[PDB]
């Protein structure tokens, strides 16, 4: 009988909700009001990197905080050297449509994918010289959305068919099939300790997963619209995400609650990417208004604007060393800030 | 060090040189998105012209054209459609014969949705009324789905082919006028709609002529001459 199942599901949802709201006493703003807010931070473009044909869509920093990779809808993947404003590698992709990019922790491997449902793995340090494909991963029914490297051997992937997977690139087999989402899974990120990861989907919700065991631990449903981007706090006890509803929110994994919401009266556009600085006291985000905004993470107020673009910003990232910021956009130019 | 700096600079020069040549080819080629209902006769039309997205490469009078089919992608399309914002032209296929559903109404709603999207406004659409012969043979009721058909009449400027029954002309022109109205309702951006009837290997020339008009209208608009 479906009616009794609906009744028990909704009453258990009510139990979840009332427990969650009973576990709360005050907001983070009320407790953190005491500290001195950070003064308005000026940001400048220290260099501009050019060469893409059109509409960069993804990028990711390297652990060295010097090299970075980016792709564009032309099918080209470029590796840059921030300190010398030079490019070192270029990859012609077999498919003209791209959706994500990833950078391995050790820098030995780089991965990307798109609408072809196939995730390609590239070995930069090939003994034959130049650069060649190491393996091609397939099995998703929907388009690949985003992927990240747990290490040099394991890669996690998400797709627009409610399925998220973990791959052992040596085997090329889907080792685990994370399932439970209702719609397309957009973005995901890995915790600093690599013990857990979260993913946002087109369900106004985000979920936490166990890499080893494979089941979902808990879900957050603070937002009112589809989740577009998600990122972790510099420590694994919190994470933040943005949505197309023109709001940004911070969640705590241990508290299992919505801690803060970022919004403004003069913004009517969604968010494409978010990131944190090394200390976690500075949160950066990109918006459809051709500019990026930065908030004092612990005070919930704007501290600066990065208006160096003239087209939709599609990706954003912060170095592991916390020394600079980079931003890609739908125009062929990307800006680096410090 | 000087040696590695020079090596990096010459590598950058090499990559730029090997990139420009591809850049020219990419700029010269025009990409076309093929869209429509699964059972709307897409197979016949793609056979006429000739893993997720399927791609086909063909040549017409020294102009390179790429057609991308939705293929195996999930029915939900609100996300990945925005990726195609830079296509030269969208070719829309709809079966005018209309079954399990009111196919024509769903096609109209999808056309309106893709027409009024804030990202797609910069891209025009080419509309093909497929399966016209099948529609003619089957009609030889549109009333129930479209009550207005009980009073609509063929426009005075119509040019029916010899041997065509007046009812077929009335039906086809009514269906065309529905899309024309739902398209001209907005008329705000660079987008346009170029309806066509088909049954027809000539459709390649039809698409080619529309593509020339789309590129012409763009350059003239940039100069603000139109």
């Amino acid at each position: 009988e479906l009616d009794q199942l609906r009744q028990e599901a909704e009453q258990l949802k009510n139990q979840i909700r009332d427990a969650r709201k009973a576990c709360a006493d005050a907001t983070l703003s009320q407790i953190t009001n005491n500290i001195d807010p950070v003064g308005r931070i000026q940001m400048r473009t220290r260099r501009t990197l050019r060469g893409h044909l059109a509409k960069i869509y993804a990028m990711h920093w390297g652990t060295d905080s010097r090299l970075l990779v980016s792709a564009s809808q032309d099918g080209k993947l470029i590796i840059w050297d921030s300190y010398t404003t030079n490019k070192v590698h270029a990859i012609p992709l077999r498919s003209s449509w791209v959706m994500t990019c990833a950078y391995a922790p050790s820098g030995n491997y780089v991965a990307c994918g798109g609408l072809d449902n196939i995730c390609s793995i590239y070995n930069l340090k090939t003994r034959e010289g130049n650069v060649r494909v190491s393996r091609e991963l397939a099995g998703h029914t929907g388009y690949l959305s985003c992927c990240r490297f747990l290490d040099d051997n394991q890669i996690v992937t998400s797709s627009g068919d409610t399925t998220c997977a973990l791959w052992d690139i040596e085997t090329g087999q889907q080792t685990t099939t994370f399932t439970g989402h209702t719609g397309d899974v957009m973005s995901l990120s890995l915790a600093p300790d690599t013990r857990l990861f979260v993913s946002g989907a087109c369900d106004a919700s985000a979920k936490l997963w166990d890499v080893r065991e494979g089941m979902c631990r808990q879900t957050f449903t603070g937002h009112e619209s589809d989740i577009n981007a998600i990122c972790f706090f510099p420590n694994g006890n919190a994470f933040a995400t943005g949505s197309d509803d023109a709001t940004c929110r911070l969640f705590d994994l241990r508290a299992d609650q919505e801690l803060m919401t970022y919004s403004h009266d003069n913004i009517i556009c969604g968010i494409t990417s978010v990131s944190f600085s090394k200390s976690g006291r500075l949160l950066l985000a990109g918006y459809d208004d051709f500019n990026c905004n930065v908030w004092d993470a612990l005070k919930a107020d704007r501290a600066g604007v990065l208006a160096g673009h003239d087209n939709r910003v599609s990706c954003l990232g912060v170095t592991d060393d916390g020394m600079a910021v980079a931003t890609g956009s739908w125009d062929s130019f990307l800006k680096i800030w410090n | 060090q000087r040696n590695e700096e020079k090596a990096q600079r010459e590598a950058n020069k090499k990559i730029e040189k090997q990139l420009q040549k591809d850049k020219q080819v990419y700029r010269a080629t025009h990409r076309l998105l093929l869209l429509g209902a699964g059972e709307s006769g897409k197979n016949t039309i793609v056979k006429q012209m000739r893993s997720g997205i399927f791609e086909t490469k063909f040549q017409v009078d020294k102009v390179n054209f790429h057609m991308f089919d939705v293929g195996a992608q999930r029915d939900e399309r609100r996300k990945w459609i925005q990726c195609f914002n830079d296509v030269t032209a969208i070719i829309f296929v709809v079966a005018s014969s209309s079954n399990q559903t009111n196919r024509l109404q769903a096609a109209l709603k999808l056309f309106d949705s893709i027409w009024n999207n804030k990202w797609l406004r910069d891209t025009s659409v080419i509309l093909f009324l497929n399966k016209q012969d099948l529609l003619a043979e089957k009609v030889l009721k549109i009333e129930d789905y479209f009550p207005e058909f009980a009073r609509y009449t063929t426009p005075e400027d119509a040019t029916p082919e010899p041997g065509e029954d007046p009812r077929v002309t009335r039906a086809k022109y009514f269906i065309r006028d529905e899309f024309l109205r739902i398209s001209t309702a907005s008329g705000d951006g660079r987008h346009y709609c170029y309806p066509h009837f088909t049954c027809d290997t000539e459709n390649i020339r039809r698409v080619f002529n529309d593509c020339r008009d789309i590129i012409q209208r763009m350059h003239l608009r940039q100069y603000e001459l139109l």
Partner: nanobody, 126 residues
């Protein structure tokens, strides 16, 4: 979280009239375009009617044109749909559907299956 509710179904004799209602919570009701979608037995989902954010613009499917009437009231974040002169082929499961993104005119995937922002449906028989 985004959730929807609907009610007002039941058995209505042919030639009668009945009213449908839809309720929502957890989001800014006034900022989202809405739709009505039905599912006849052994048939796919079909669009019925839609209205703008302020309720100014309005449209219907040609089958129910002139017969159906829709209304909205943002003051209490509820959606209403009225039908009259029912005939046998009007029977179907009716879904209250929200458009995906706010502050927009387009509405993609409303009739598509597995759409996350649709209600459980309401049954009507003749």
């Amino acid at each position: 979280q985004v959730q929807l509710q609907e009610s007002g179904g039941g058995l209505v004799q042919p030639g009668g009239s009945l009213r449908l209602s839809c309720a929502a919570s957890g989001f800014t009701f006034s900022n989202y375009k809405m739709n009505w979608v039905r599912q006849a037995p052994g048939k796919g989902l079909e669009w019925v009617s839609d209205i703008s954010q302020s309720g100014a613009s309005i449209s219907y499917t040609g089958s129910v044109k002139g017969r159906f009437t829709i209304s909205r009231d943002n003051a209490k974040n509820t959606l209403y749909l009225q039908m009259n002169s029912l005939k046998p082929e009007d029977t179907a499961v009716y879904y209250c559907a929200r458009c995906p993104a706010p502050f927009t005119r387009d509405c993609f995937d409303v009739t598509s299956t597995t759409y996350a922002y649709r209600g459980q449906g309401t049954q009507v028989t003749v």
